[PDB]
Design a protein around this ligand. Structure first.
Ligand code: EHZ
Ligand code: SF4
Ligand code: SF4
Ligand code: SF4
Ligand code: SF4
Ligand code: FES
Ligand code: K
Ligand code: ZN
Lengths: 96, 48, 129, 87, 209, 115, 119, 699
């Protein structure tokens, strides 16, 4: 979620906000600070974890050639989830 | 779009905005990275 | 050797007045003449074959608008390549650049023996393969 | 006030011109140190260096005599004079 | 041709150009240092700098050469050579439907002869070589800068000239004119080290030192 | 080879002769430049600038380097005479906008890292 | 045509997750060096950019960045009416480019679906 | 003269017997492709990328492992050799993950480059790929193990170079995996070197992750100051920021290895940095001020005291330029109390003879040794690359190692003699059995750690060890050129400071406390304000606010070792110079320039305005300080030994205990590594366990 700085400046998804003594805040006066309000980390955190029944699962991001390079994810660790290193989708074996 | 509507996404703007140049809604650039070097803060306690 | 009206000239070639380089970037610069080290990330040796001339790195600050890396050094990216050290030092001397040149570091020859991995009485025997 | 703070002896390991100072260090330096225990006598050998004696006096004032092709007796005289005024 | 990807090699033109290179070397031994034909059938004549006018005039006027057109005249900077500047003449023969390249060399202080008497086209090419590389051409009808700003210092196409140069231009309101200042970049050019540490072409491998 | 070929001058005196001719031409041109370009400087200022430009290269001993310097000086003179240069080009010899850079060790130490 | 190269945008997966995994291929290939990238591991461990700038006044609008991109993250969109009254509004930010993506994704995706079989 | 003649594509070369095909091709300038082969490791011969055709031989041979035969013609570019390479590359890429955009190796891989240069351009693998689960071996190496091509380079390195047998392979066939089997940290001073030897992104640096690509970095070649080895390094920078530290090959010092502190403590260069001059306000607190104001304060205090009233202490990270500048400045006020934090015995010869205080055998010289004796030192953590060389000679040369001190683990088996210093007298008198071993040895070596000279009986320890070395040199058991006596230093600034005439240790300042104390990067805490009169005016000059900065009256922000061109002399005596990779942050300045400016403001202007001039001053004080990369021999060990016999000091009964007994004491040693969060993570992982420091390596 997009929060606010103690000065009232809006904090971006990279965690950027000028401190209270930074003169560079004058650039936003009589203007606005451009912040994208769709934090991708919080959005990918909302996706469920797929209960696929295999030790190795494949993920290409969905949409075939319109996704990402196809990768194979190991699902042998029973404490962690196997997540795709391209799009963040998570996978796990059924109910351990 | 009446016959072939676009695919619905939850992150797509539901309200299109025109060119806001010359308005207080105009985009102003800034560095999106955090500070690289952290300075040493002196102790608040004096040595004497 | 040819009819060119050979005129006697000193053997200290100095083209600094003709290069158009501002005077600050001749006397105060210090170039480095070296064979670049092998990038330890790879085991390819094809980048350690020619001599390089690089200038001393000056100040880079942060652009107030975008946070970009600014410079006032025209020679920050200037990198010349040479076949031998002698060519590099001649080029640096005729251009009036103070230089320090370091000797090329090549790998020393090494005695590799696969059969040592299974030595009967030496510590070179490996416990795993 | 201008007493002697330290002396530096520069020489070379192989060059024939530093052979007298090499002999001096071999046969006389230990006695010089036993007579001057608190005087820094910094012997720094470096290849292809002309032999030189440095004497640093009070307030950073230094003077160097040259020891090239000196005999060990000449280096002994040169150190005696430095360490005792005359110079 | 079961090799649809490889460029086809034409050996007849290679032989023709080899024979003509032998011919040219034999007719002018006084100036020809080397002649070679590329794998893509391009013939080069390496000459002493003194032979520019004789060799060029021979190639223009000889009935077996008839290289009437000067396609291009340029220079190449190679700092590791004592004669750093490589002067390249590209000539075309309409009569024999052939092209030839003539190359010589010079350094910062030796003048190359102007070839404007051989080709009228050389007038602006030699001015451009002088402008961008600093090579003087003796007996040029009008030698001066052609491409760079008036009063520009340096020769930008030299390999040791910086990419953005040394001065910038801007309008100054105090003095009411455009002024020149030392160059400052809000974002400096980002140097990329792209060369692979592995050898690409074994056939061009130089013998070890 | 052991020797090299000249540009024009086979000796240092010939190079000096051509330098003096170029200096003469520039010295006579300066008043016409001041009048024609409508420069806000004096003729004394312009001629002192010409002299100071000549004095930058006084350390040159190679007759070929001197010859090339003379060639470039004549080129500059012809750009000035034919009014190929603008007023901004003539006024670039006088770095009126650039601030006085420091020269002593202390001020350079104060303002940054450059030697 | 769907191939038209206009204003740039950064795209997302249907999950809302960014597509850019900060490989820097677009920055490497950019003929004008218009792309500036800084990256680091995100708090969730993802490989994501912290800086993604395009100097639109350095840009030559060649589309090499969207060719180099392995995940269709950076694209040139259909927009061509984005003139500005100041030079500074043409130095795009990561937030600006992501808002461009969210603004134009509906037609960007349709264009890509129209032309991706040629790519 | 026993060279045999072999042919590489018809060109004849003369090679020593036992030279492999790969080496014979290497001496004509042809680099055979390889993954598993490393010249500094044992030969494995498993990746099969080096397969090459021998003319007239039907079967290809592994060039890395096959010794050349007389008359062999190596066909390095024949069609059979190319097809072998293409097949091997196809097999390597069959199960390789499509991770190039998300893998840190991309752009400097080896798999990528040799796929481009020697493999095909397309795939015919129409199946599902392998995937193995990740292994956690500590907070330094990120193991994305499904990228592993099973070249065994990491295992061979860990077993041979590092001496820890933790890496290995479990299973067989296609599901054979490289790891530790159990969940175990790969803790070693040399652990980070398996990242560079790994040809692929299987082993990567956690601190460097996702942060830069190889092509955009600028590579500045410099020297490490985290120890006295002086390891040659490359500093990767991008857009004015230090990005990472890499080893730079030097066969005589560090080969192609660096220690983990050298590799990863650059994290501290971005924290606790001194950026602006500071003075004390009327409330007694440090506040930012201009350079002129602070320098004028110091100069006012400078030209009011003289002699013993003004003194200086040099820290462990100080260049020779700053050292000589401060010495000249203090001499201008007739002060000779220029000290270091690290004590060396000043009795007898003291610092006068250079051979008294350095590693005379040199780092390359331990290979030639027959037996080494280690006294009161832990070379594993004091000087990791010197200990690596000792293990290299222990492994190949069958070097025999003995130690006096704590039975510390050194990654190689040695003979432990004891920990009381009384054994040194026992050996010197010839009573101990190991005295015979030293005597019946052609190239014996006795190494005394600088850490053992910090004791109160360090003078007697040095005297006893010299008595040992001389006792085996008065008998014809060793040649004259061989040096037996060595001092192993752990402080990067120590040998340069000793060379320039600094007093070893801060005993002079304790004897005569100053009214003006220059703390030149001194963060050891040897001298505190309770050892100073009441109102000592303490100046601190440095790059970090760690220990000295809190107590100072004025703060002068200096440059770190990556921010200046600076001379550092290593434990064996060779001067090396760094180059600036970035400029100092904020208003921080080069140290010798700060001292020169202060001298000019004080009216005692030093006679150098330039780095070349201060370096010529260094030459005037000690000429070896400008002979970069050259090790100058130092003689007159016998003079030092006959001077050392007049001090007749006794030995304490205290056992010789090194400051660093385990790895947790290795990471945090200086101000830069105390400001490093990577070093903090390393200490946390070492002391608590593997679950302590956590990080999602999920991309
Ligand atoms: C209108 C405002 C101004 C607008 C226009 C401002 C610029 C006007 C001048 C532009 C040209 C510039 O001066 C460069 C040239 O011509 S350089 C000629 C060679 N220059 C030398 O120096 C050779 C070597 N020098 C010596 O041999 C002696 O030192 C010397 C000759 C100097 C005195 O000899 P003397 O016998 O002691
Ligand atoms: S369109 Fe071309 S110039 Fe513009 S950012 Fe992309 S690659 Fe760079
Ligand atoms: S936009 Fe695409 S090409 Fe550019 S860094 Fe991100 S993933 Fe790589
Ligand atoms: S190690 Fe990384 S860069 Fe190299 S081939 Fe594998 S995924 Fe690509
Ligand atoms: S982890 Fe790396 S070094 Fe170890 S076997 Fe696999 S590829 Fe080789
Ligand atoms: S390199 Fe010889 S088999 Fe791997
Ligand atoms: K690796
Ligand atoms: Zn995915």
């Amino acid at each position: 979620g997009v929060r606010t700085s103690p000065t009232g400046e809006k904090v971006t998804h990279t965690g950027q906000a000028y401190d209270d003594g930074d003169y560079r805040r004058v650039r936003f006066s009589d203007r606005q600070k451009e912040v994208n309000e769709n934090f991708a980390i919080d959005l990918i955190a909302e996706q469920p974890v797929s209960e696929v029944g295999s030790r190795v699962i494949s993920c290409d991001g969905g949409g075939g050639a319109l996704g990402h390079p196809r990768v194979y994810i190991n699902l042998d660790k029973e404490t962690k989830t196997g997540t795709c290193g391209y799009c963040g989708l998570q996978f796990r074996q059924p109910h351990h | 779009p009446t016959t072939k509507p676009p695919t619905a996404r939850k992150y797509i703007w539901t309200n299109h905005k025109f060119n806001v140049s010359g308005t207080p809604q105009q985009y102003v650039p800034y560095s999106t990275t955090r500070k690289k070097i952290q300075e040493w803060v002196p102790p608040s306690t004096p040595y004497k | 050797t040819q009819d060119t009206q050979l005129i006697a000239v000193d053997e200290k070639l100095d083209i600094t007045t003709l290069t158009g380089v501002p005077e600050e970037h001749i006397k105060t610069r210090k170039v480095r003449i070296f064979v670049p080290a092998r990038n330890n990330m790879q085991s390819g040796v094809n980048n350690t074959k020619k001599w390089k001339m690089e200038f001393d790195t000056r100040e880079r600050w942060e652009n107030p608008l975008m946070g970009w890396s600014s410079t006032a050094d025209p020679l920050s990216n200037l990198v010349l390549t040479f076949s031998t050290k002698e060519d590099a030092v001649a080029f640096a001397e005729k251009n009036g650049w103070s230089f320090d040149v370091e000797e090329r570091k090549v790998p020393k020859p090494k005695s590799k023996s696969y059969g040592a991995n299974f030595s009967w009485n030496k510590r070179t025997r490996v416990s795993t393969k | 006030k201008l007493g002697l703070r330290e002396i530096r002896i520069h020489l070379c390991q192989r060059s024939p011109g530093s052979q007298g100072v090499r002999d001096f260090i071999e046969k006389r330096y230990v006695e010089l140190k036993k007579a001057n225990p608190d005087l820094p006598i910094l012997i720094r050998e470096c290849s292809d260096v002309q032999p030189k004696l440095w004497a640093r006096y009070a307030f950073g004032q230094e003077k160097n005599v040259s020891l090239n092709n000196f005999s060990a007796d000449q280096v002994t005289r040169t150190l005696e004079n430095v360490l005792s005024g005359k110079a | 041709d079961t090799r649809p990807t490889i460029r086809p090699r034409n050996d007849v033109v290679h032989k023709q150009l080899s024979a003509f290179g032998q011919y040219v070397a034999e007719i002018l031994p006084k100036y020809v240092q080397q002649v070679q034909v590329s794998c893509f059938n391009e013939l080069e004549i390496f000459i002493h700098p003194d032979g520019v006018i004789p060799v060029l005039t021979f190639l223009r006027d000889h009935t077996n050469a008839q290289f009437k057109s000067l396609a291009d005249l340029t220079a190449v900077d190679v700092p590791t050579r004592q004669n750093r500047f490589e002067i390249v003449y590209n000539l075309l023969s309409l009569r024999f439907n052939s092209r030839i390249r003539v190359k010589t060399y010079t350094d910062e202080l030796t003048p190359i002869e102007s070839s404007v008497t051989v080709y009228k086209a050389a007038n602006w090419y030699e001015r451009e070589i002088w402008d961008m590389f600093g090579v003087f051409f003796a007996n040029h009808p009008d030698l001066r800068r052609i491409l760079t700003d008036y009063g520009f210092e340096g020769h930008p196409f030299r390999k040791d000239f910086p990419l953005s140069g040394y001065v910038e231009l801007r309008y100054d309101d105090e003095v009411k004119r455009v002024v020149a200042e030392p160059v400052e970049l809000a974002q400096e050019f980002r140097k990329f080290d792209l060369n692979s540490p592995w050898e690409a072409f074994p056939a061009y491998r130089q013998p070890p030192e | 080879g052991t020797s090299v070929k000249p540009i024009f001058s086979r000796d240092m005196n010939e190079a000096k002769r051509r330098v003096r001719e170029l200096y003469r031409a520039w010295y006579r041109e300066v008043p016409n430049t001041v009048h024609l370009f409508q420069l806000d400087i004096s003729v004394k200022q312009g001629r002192d600038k010409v002299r100071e430009m000549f004095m930058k290269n006084a350390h040159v001993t190679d007759p070929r380097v001197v010859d090339l310097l003379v060639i470039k000086g004549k080129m500059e003179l012809e750009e000035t005479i034919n009014v190929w240069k603008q007023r901004t080009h003539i006024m670039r010899f006088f770095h009126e906008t650039e601030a006085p850079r420091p020269t002593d060790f202390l001020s350079k130490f104060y303002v940054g890292h450059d030697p | 045509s769907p191939r038209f190269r206009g204003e740039h945008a950064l795209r997302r997966y249907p999950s809302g997750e960014e597509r850019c995994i900060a490989c820097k291929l677009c920055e490497a290939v950019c003929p004008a060096q218009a792309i500036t990238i800084e990256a680091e591991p995100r708090a969730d461990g993802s490989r994501r950019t912290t800086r993604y700038d395009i100097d639109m006044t350095k840009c030559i609008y060649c589309g090499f960045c969207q060719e180099a991109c392995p995940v269709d993250a950076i694209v040139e969109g259909p927009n061509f009416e984005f003139s500005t009254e100041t030079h500074e509004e043409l130095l795009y930010n990561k937030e600006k480019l992501l808002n461009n993506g969210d603004k134009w994704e509906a037609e960007i995706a349709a264009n890509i679906q129209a032309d991706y079989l040629y790519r | 003269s026993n060279l045999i003649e072999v042919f590489v594509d018809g060109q004849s070369v003369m090679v020593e017997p036992g030279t492999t095909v790969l080496q014979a091709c290497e001496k004509v300038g042809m680099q055979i492709p390889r993954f598993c082969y490393h010249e500094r490791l044992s030969v494995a011969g498993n990746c099969r990328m080096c397969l090459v055709e021998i003319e007239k031989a039907p079967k290809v041979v592994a060039a890395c492992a096959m010794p050349v035969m007389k008359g062999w013609n190596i066909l390095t570019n024949s069609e059979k050799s190319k097809k072998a390479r293409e097949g091997v590359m196809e097999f390597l890429l069959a199960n390789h993950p499509l991770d190039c955009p998300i893998c840190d190796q991309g752009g400097e891989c080896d798999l990528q480059d040799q796929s481009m240069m020697f493999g095909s351009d397309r795939s015919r693998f129409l199946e599902g790929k392998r995937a193995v689960e990740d292994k956690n071996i500590g907070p330094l190496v990120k193991t994305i193990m499904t990228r592993c091509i099973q070249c065994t380079r990491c295992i061979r390195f860990a077993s041979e170079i590092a001496g820890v047998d933790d890496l290995g392979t479990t299973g067989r066939g296609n599901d054979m995996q490289v790891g530790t089997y159990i969940e175990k940290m790969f803790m070693s001073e040399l652990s980070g070197n398996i990242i560079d030897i790994c040809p692929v992104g299987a082993l990567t640096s956690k601190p460097y992750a996702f942060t830069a690509r190889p092509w955009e970095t600028r590579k500045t070649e410099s020297i490490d100051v985290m120890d006295a080895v002086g390891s040659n390094i490359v500093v990767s920078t991008r857009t004015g920021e230090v990005m990472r530290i890499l080893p730079r090959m030097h066969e005589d010092i560090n080969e192609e290895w660096i220690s983990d502190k050298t590799r990863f403590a650059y994290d501290g260069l971005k924290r606790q940095r001194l950026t602006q001059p500071m003075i004390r306000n009327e409330k007694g607190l440090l506040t930012y001020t201009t350079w002129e104001d602070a320098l004028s304060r110091v100069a006012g205090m400078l030209q009011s005291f003289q002699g013993n009233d003004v003194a200086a202490i040099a820290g462990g990270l100080v260049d020779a330029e700053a050292l000589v500048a401060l010495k000249d400045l203090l001499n201008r006020v007739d002060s000779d109390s220029l000290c270091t934090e690290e004590v060396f015995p000043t009795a007898g010869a003291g610092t006068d003879l250079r051979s008294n205080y350095l590693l005379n055998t040199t780092i390359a010289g331990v290979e030639e040794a027959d037996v080494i004796l280690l006294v009161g030192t832990n070379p594993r953590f004091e000087a990791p690359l010197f200990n690596a060389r000792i293990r290299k000679s222990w492994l190949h040369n069958d070097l025999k190692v003995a130690l006096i001190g704590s039975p510390v683990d050194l990654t190689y088996r040695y003979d432990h003699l004891g920990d009381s210093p009384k054994i040194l007298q026992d050996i010197a008198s010839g009573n101990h059995p190991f005295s015979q071993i030293l005597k019946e040895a052609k190239k014996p070596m006795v190494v005394l750690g600088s850490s053992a000279l910090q004791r109160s009986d360090g003078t007697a320890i040095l005297a006893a060890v010299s008595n040992i070395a001389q006792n085996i040199r008065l008998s014809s058991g060793v040649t004259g050129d061989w040096k037996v006596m060595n001092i192993l230093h752990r402080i990067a600034s120590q040998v340069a400071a000793l060379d320039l005439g600094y007093k070893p240790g801060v005993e002079a300042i304790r004897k005569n406390p100053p009214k003006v104390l220059f703390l030149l990067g001194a963060d050891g805490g040897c001298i505190t304000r309770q050892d100073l009169p009441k109102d000592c005016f303490i100046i601190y000059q440095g790059h970090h606010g760690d220990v000295g900065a809190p107590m100072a009256d004025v703060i002068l922000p200096g440059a770190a070792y990556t921010e200046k061109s600076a001379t550092y002399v290593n434990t064996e005596g060779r001067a090396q110079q760094t180059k600036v990779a970035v400029t100092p942050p904020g208003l921080a300045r080069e140290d010798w320039k700060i001292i020169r400016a202060l001298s000019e403001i004080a009216g005692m202007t030093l006679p150098y305005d330039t780095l070349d001039q201060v370096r010529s001053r260094l030459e005037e004080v000690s000429p070896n300080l400008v002979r970069y990369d050259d090790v100058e021999g130092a003689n007159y060990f016998q003079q030092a030994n006959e001077l050392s016999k007049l001090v007749n000091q006794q030995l304490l009964a205290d056992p010789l205990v090194p400051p660093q007994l385990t790895i947790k004491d290795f990471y945090m040693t200086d101000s830069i590594s105390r400001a490093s969060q990577t070093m903090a993570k390393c200490v946390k992982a070492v002391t608590e366990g593997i679950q302590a420091v956590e990080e999602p390596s999920i991309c």
